[model samples]
Target chain A: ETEVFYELAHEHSVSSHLDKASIMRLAISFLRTHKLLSSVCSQMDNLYLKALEGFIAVVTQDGDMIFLSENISKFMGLTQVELTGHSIFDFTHPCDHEEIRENLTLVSTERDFFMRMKCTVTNRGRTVNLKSATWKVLHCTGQVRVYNPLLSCLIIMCEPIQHPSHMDIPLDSKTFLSRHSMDMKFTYCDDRILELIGYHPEELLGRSAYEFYHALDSENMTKSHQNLCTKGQVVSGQYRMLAKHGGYVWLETQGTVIYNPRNLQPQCIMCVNYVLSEIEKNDVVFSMDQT
Target chain B: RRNKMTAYITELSDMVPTCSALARKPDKLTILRMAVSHMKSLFLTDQELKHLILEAADGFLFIVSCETGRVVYVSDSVTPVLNQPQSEWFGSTLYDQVHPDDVDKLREQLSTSENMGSRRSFICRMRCGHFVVVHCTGYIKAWPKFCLVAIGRLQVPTEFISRHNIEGIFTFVDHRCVATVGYQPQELLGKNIVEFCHPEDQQLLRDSFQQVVKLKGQVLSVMFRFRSKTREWLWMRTSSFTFQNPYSDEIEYIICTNTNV
Candidate 1:
C-alpha cells in the first residue's frame, strides 16, 4: 500500500523528497490508484510479493499478524513464525528501547505520535535512518489498540530535510511558528516581518514587551508582561498598534513563556503578533459567494 | 346384430330413468323394493345380481366362484384406485394389489369373514405406484348360486380434497394456462394455480366455487385474479361447466375457459 521512490548514484543515495502536504496529496492519489492496482496485483505471481517488498507489516492485538509480506523475511532476516507473536520493540536496537517504549505509551494514550531514529538491525547488519509513525487502532468491535507499522505509518507525509544552505535566512513568522515556536526566542525575523513592521530584528530583540502595546495601557501591559516573563507563560488578546504605513492596526498576540530546562527558572518569553486588518471580511464573503 | 345390441343398451338405459323415479319416492320401503326389483330384472344370474348390488354401493365388488376363490367379475372403477384393470382382474387373485405389508392381515380377515353374515370392516392399503390406504368392508351374500361378492370404496383422505370446493376446477390435470398462452408446455405443469390466484379475489373465488358445485350443472362465470411469473396480477373471467362421466356416472370433470377480464 506504500510507494517509495529512491535514487541511487555511486556511494550517495537520496530518498524521495516531498513536503508533508504534497506527500499527503500524492499518497491519497496513490491510495485510490492502489485499490485499482490491487486487483491486477493479486493476479501476479506470489500474490504481488514484489510489490510488498519495502512495505510495513501491520500487527493486530491478541498477537495476530497482518500485512506481513513474504519479503519481510528477506528484509528482517526472520521467518513468518518468528516475526509473529512478538512486539516491534523486541527487534528495535537497545539504545532506542526506552524512547520507543515512551513513544508507544504516549501513542496509546493519544491519537498519534511520531519519532525519527537511527537504529541498527543486527539481522540487516547495517544502520539505517527510519521515521516511525504510530496510530491508535480502531477495531470494528469498538476495541482500540496501538498499531505501529515499520513502514507507511505516517500521519504527515514524508518531507525532505532542509539543509542549512536551503533554509531562508531570517525566518518568516509563519515559518517560525511551524518549525520553531513562540517558546523559542526571535533568533531573527525575516524581511517579510521586517517590511510589515518597518523595524529590523535589532529594534524588537531584547526590548520590553510593553513597547508593542497601546500607550493608554502601557503601565498595566508592562506589569502583565513582567508577570508573564517571570511565570513563563502567555495569554492571547487583542492589542491596537501603529502600523508602519501610518494607519492604526489591531493585532492579536500570543506569547508562551518557556523556562530553561537545566536551571528550571524563567529564561525568555516568545510571542507572535498577527495584524487583524490584513484579514478582510469583504474578501471572505466574495470567495464564499464564488464557491 | 349391431342394431339389436343398440336396442338392448337403450332398454338398459331406460331402466336408469325408472330407477331414478323410484329413488324420488317419499317412503324408504318403496325405494328399497324398487331397487331390489330393478336389480332382479337387470341381472341374468344370481352371481350377476350380487355383483350389481355391490357395484351400486360405494365399495370394491368381486364375484368369485364357490369352490375356488377365482374371481368371476370385478368392477372397472377399481382400476384407478387399485391400479387393476377389470379384464386382468377377472379370474385373478383379489389380493394381487394388496400391500405386501398388509397381506397377512387381509388374509386373516378374509378367512374369519368367509361365513359370517355380519359385514366386517378393516383398514387396508392397496399398492399401486404408492400405497393408497382405505377402509374395506367385506361380506358374502348367498343367492341362487353360492358366490362371494366383496365391495370397497376409495376412502379419500380429508387432506386430499377440500369439501367446500370438492367439484370446483381447483386445478387442471394436464392443462396449464401459461402453456395455453403460447409459452412452453410443462413450464407450469406441476405448479399450483393458487400460486397465481390474486390476493384480493381469492375469497370471492372460494365463494364462486361453492355456488358452482351447489348448482351442479350450472355454468358459473366469475372474475378471478391470477398472478403471473413476473408477479403481474391477471384478472380472468372463468366460465366453468360441470359434466358427468358416461362410464362411471360420476361428476368426472370441470372444464373452464379463462379469458382476460
Candidate 2:
C-alpha cells in the first residue's frame, strides 16, 4: 500500500510543482473521507483484510484489485505484491471464473444481499474447492444491478446459508487484527463490517483508525492507545457494528498497545473482541457479560 | 557558489577498485558491501534533509558553509535561477555571489551569536552564471551541533526550480533494483536487494551495492550479472543517483537508468 501512495505522489509531484508534502497529505485524506462520501456504512470497516484466515476475494468492481491485503497469501501462500496486478479469475476453478464472471456484478446496494456459488481456490497447481473443503459455506454479498451504483463490492462475508458440510471443522475461521503506528496513523485493520472479520478482512490499511471514530469514541480509542503505551492494555467497552442482514452489531473490545522493537516506543494498538449481546427488536443490546 | 564543505562527495564511484575486480569473486564482494556501508554515512544529515524539504517547497534549494563562510552544496535549480550550468557551482563561496557592496551586511548576519537558527531575508544580487544581478532567500542552520551549515534557494530566474531533472525512469522496488540483478520488481519488493542476486552474482551484487553506498550519492554506474525470467544470467549496466524521497523523507528510492552496455 505504500507503493500506492508512491505512485500517486510520483504522478502528482513529479510532473508539476505541487511539492511532495502537499500530495502526501491529500492522497491520505481522500482515502479516509471516501468511506463517508460513499459509506456502504458496513459495520466496523476498521477490520484487517489479510488477517482474515483463508479469505479469498473477487472484484467487487473497479478493474482488478487495486490493492490486496497482505495475508491473502495464506490462502495460496503467495505474497500480495506478486498479485497486486493480478486477480483470481483464471486462477480459480476454471469453471468458477465463468460463474464468477457471471456473478461479479454483486456489489453495494440499498439493502444488502448474499450470493453463493461453487468456487475453487488455486495457486500454482494446487486447488481447494470450498464446496468440498468446508461443506458448510463461504459467503458473498450482492453481485448487483441498476442506475446509481453505490460504492458496492462482492464481499463473501460468511456462510450461514449454504451451510458448511458435516465433514467440515467450523473451527477454521478468521481472526480479527488491526495494526497502528506509533505516529498515530491507523496503519492497518481487517475491520470491514464483521467477525468473519478474519474470514473476510478488508485492507483497513494506510488510513488511520483514529480518523474515523465519533469524537467521543475517538477520544476513547486514543485513550485506549495511551493505556496501551502505559499499562499495555485496555478496558472493556460496548461497541456497535452493522451486519449485512441489517442490524447493529454490538461487541466489547479490549486493546493492547505494542511497541517498536528497535525504538522501544509505542507502535500500535491490538484488540480482541467478542459480541456483547444480541439484537432482539433489531436494536437494543445490553453490554458484554464482561467475562 | 558551492565549495569543499563535503568534497569527498563528487568523485564518481567508478574510481573504486571494484571496477577492476568485477571479474573476480569473494574478495570483491566484501569490498563492495563495505562501500555500501561507507556511502550510507554520507547521506544528507537528517537536519539538512528536513530543512531542504521546506526550502524545496518554497521554490529554491541552496548550498552554504557549516563555518558560515562557504557554500557546500547547491542544487541544480540553481541553474536557471543563477544562469549557471547544473554542475558549475560546487566549491564556490557564498561570499563571492553576493553583490560586492552587500557582502559585509550578509557577513554580519551570519556572525551574530544571539541569532542562531533565526530566519532572515536579504536584498542581495547573485551571479546568474553571468555577473547578472538576481536574488534568492537565505537561512542559517546550527546544523552540526551549533553554527555550521546553511540552506538557500537553488532556483533559476523564471521560478523553474525542481528537485532533480528527469532522465529516463525505471522504477522496480526490490532492493537490488538499485544494485544489480532482477527476479522481477515484485519478487524483490519487500526482500533485501541482495536476496535475488544469482548465487554466483551475490558477492558481485553485494560488492556493487557496497560501492554505491560507499560513494554515498556519488555513484554514477554499476555493472553486474542479473537473473532474467528464463533463469539465464544477463549482464547489465545501470547508473543510479540516490536521494531522499522528498515525501517520506527516507532514502526509499533512487532513479536508475539502465544503459545498453
Candidate 3:
C-alpha cells in the first residue's frame, strides 16, 4: 500500500523524492495548524454570537446564504448547518423577493434593509422548537463586501421583531374597543358601543364599519381605511358616525390591522373609538361620551 | 513630528464615536487605514465639500443596525431636525422615537429592498415627546456595516389663483373669495397640493401631476378631496395643465381650475 501511494503521488506530479517529502510535511503542518485555530475561533465565535439578540447572515449576491450564526436556530427554527448554503429566496416570502433582489444588487456603500421572512419555529411558554413556524418581519442592516472579482456578498444583522408582552386597554367610558373582520365587518363590538353610541353589539355584528359612518364623511373613513390597510395602523381623522337615536356623533378611531403570522395577510382589525363631540341628536351623548 | 502626528490621530479617532473601549481607540495602523479610505473619497473640492455640508446643516443623518433596530449612529444635527440629542438616540431602538401609528409604515419602507440604492422619501411622525412630521430621504448602502444611512429634514408646513411652480408648490392663488377650500390665497401659497389631498388619494394626485408634466400640455382631470379651511374634506374635480411661456418655450408653471365634484 505504501509503495502504491508513492507511485500514485509520483504519477500525480510529485516527481522528486524531496518534493514529495516537502509536500507531505507542509500539508500535515497546515492541517494541524488549521484545526487548532479553528477550535479557538469556534469558541470565540460562540461567545460573541451568544451575546447577540439577532443572528448574523452572510448572503451572496445570488441570494445564497452561505454562512449563518449558530444562534440562527433560536431565531429561525432552522439549524445553522441546515440553512447554510441554502438560497434565502426559498425561506423568505415570495412577495418580498423583488425587494431582496433590489438590496442584493449592492448599489450603495451600505444599505440597511427591513424584510419579513418565514420562521419555522415558535416559542410557547418558554418551550422553543420547530413545531409551528411563522412569518416575522426582520430588520437586516449590513454593508456589501466584495469577496472575489465575480463575487459580492452582504454581511447583515438579521433581527426579527420582538413582540412586547403584557398590554392592557382603557377601562374608561369615553373609550371603547371593537374588533372587525378583514373586510371591516364587525366581529366583536365593546359593551360601551351600546351605552355611548346607542347601538348594541349584536346590531353591529356582520355590518361593515363604513355602513355606520356618515356618507358625507366617506372621504375621511376611506383615508383612514387606506392607512390602516397599508401602514398597519392609523389614528383616523375625525368623522361622523351615525347614532341609533338620530343625526350623528363626531368620532375618531385608532385602528390596527392584525396580520396572520402564518401568511402575513391581514386577519382582522382592532379599533379604539373615541367620541369627540355631539353633532346634532343623541340625548345621552354629552353624559358618557365626554372624555 | 511623530508625536505631533500621534496627537492629530488621537484627536481624529476620538472625534468619531465607535464601539466602546477596545474597539473605539485607533492605533496608528487603524488611523492610517481610515486616513487612506477618507482620502480616496476626496474627489470634491474643499469649497464644494464645505457648501455641501452647509446644505445638509438643516437636516440630520442617522445609521441604524438592522439586526436590533438599534440606532448605531446619529449626527449632532439630529437635535434641530428630530428634536433629540445624538446621545439620546444612540443605542436606542428607532421605533421608540417614531410615532406608534407610523412605526409599521417606517418598517415597511425600510424593508422595501426595491428602494435599495435609490433615493427614497417617506413622511412620518418623529417624537421627542410631541410628534413632529419629518421627511426622511436616503438610499440604502451595504458596506463596512449594515445599516440605514439617511437624512431627516423637518417638513416646512403651505394654494389656487391657483398657480404652482413645476414642483406643485403653489406660487400664486386667485382670490375669488375663500369659500372653496378656506385658505386666503396667501395661506395657500408656498404649500404643496399634496398637503390637502385625502391620504388615500394623495398618490393619485402625485401621479396626476407627473402625468400632466410628462404629457407636457395635456390637461388632466383629477378628482380628489382637498381639506377645506375648516379642516373638512371637500371633493373637487381639478383640471391641471402646465403653462409654457411663449417666448422661452419652456414650461414655467402649472395652472389648475377646481370645480366641485
Q: Chain A vs. true chain A, TM-score per candidate?
A: 0.30, 0.29, 0.46
Worst 10 residues of 1 chain B by lDDT: B156-165
Candidate 1: stretches off by over 4 Å: A1-87, A90-110, A119-183, A196-199, A207-291, B1-261
lDDT of 3 by residue, B53-92 (tens): 2122234667675445678767666776666777789879
lDDT of 1 by residue, A1-291 (tens): 123222111001121443222322222222222222232221112212221212233333322232233344434444433343245555544444454344323223222112221222332244233333211111000112332232222111111112222322122232222111232324444454544544456644543332333333333444444434433333334454433333334454444454568998655445545433332221111100011
Candidate chain B TM-scores, in order: 0.34, 0.32, 0.39
* Model 3 TM-score (2 dp): 0.35
> Compared with the true structure, what per-residue lDDT tens digits does model 3 show for residues A81-114?
4565557998886777887888888546465555
Per-candidate local distance difference test: 0.38, 0.38, 0.58
DockQ scores for all predicted structures: 0.00, 0.01, 0.03
The per-residue C-alpha lDDT of model 2 at residue B191 equals: 43
Residue-by-residue lDDT tens digits, candidate 2, B56-118: 222235546635556555655465456666465677767777656456545655554545444
In every candidate, what fraction of the native interface contacts is reproduced? 0.00, 0.00, 0.00
If scored against the real structure, what TM-score would every candidate get? Answer: 0.20, 0.20, 0.35
**Model 2 alpha-carbon miss at residue B57, Å:** 7.8
Clashes of each: 6, 54, 19
| Winner by DockQ between candidate 3 and candidate 1 | 3
- Worst window of 10 by summed lDDT in candidate 2 chain A: A163-172
